[PDB]
Amino acid sequence: GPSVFLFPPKPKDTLMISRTPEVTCVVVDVSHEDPEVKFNWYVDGVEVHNAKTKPREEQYNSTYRVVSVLTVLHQDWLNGKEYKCKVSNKALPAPIEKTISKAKGQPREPQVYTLPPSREEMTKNQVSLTCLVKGFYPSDIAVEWESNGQPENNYKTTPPVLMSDGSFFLASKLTVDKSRWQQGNVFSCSVMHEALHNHYTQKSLSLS
């Protein structure tokens, strides 16, 4: 039988007023015989009508993927409204309902600290600039690195780790040529999270 999967907006999209957050109700295993799918959407149990169906996609395994997309408002999401996708179809004894929302819980502000490389790292060809982000709730976030207005893409970031006080930490490590560090170049940690002022903070880092 046909199966339903419901997916949240990207954090960045819920957090940048200039972006468009959307929730997405994907239905897989849609038979060639009974391809017709009906979406009803509810927001905190109240029905809404502005969803839109994406173009039908035929798969390798002889079945259709049908996808409906609900635009949502930045603040409904961040205020925690619950979004319900209800899917009907002939091959289905009963409509499948699925619900999602932001994780429940009082938001807490990340503490964002930048950290120079270890003295002992200074022999090597490349050094690690560390961005520690500690004590945020919920785990929804974006961390990025830059220098002089341009993105620096040679970083990696840990997933959120749950802590004993109930908030999360992670760290992001950007890797530069030692000579770039030695050259006075200023680097910056971009953190986007709901409980920050204007959803954004930035911390800088240079040779002292």
């Binding site: 957090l15 940048m16 007023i17 990025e144 971009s190 986007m192 002022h197 204007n198 959803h199 954004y200």
Partner: peptide, 13 residues
């Protein structure tokens, strides 16, 4: 005030 990310507006209070 307002915050911007790579010249793209984030949010304003």
């Amino acid at each position: 005030d307002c915050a911007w990310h790579l010249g793209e507006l984030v949010w304003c209070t």
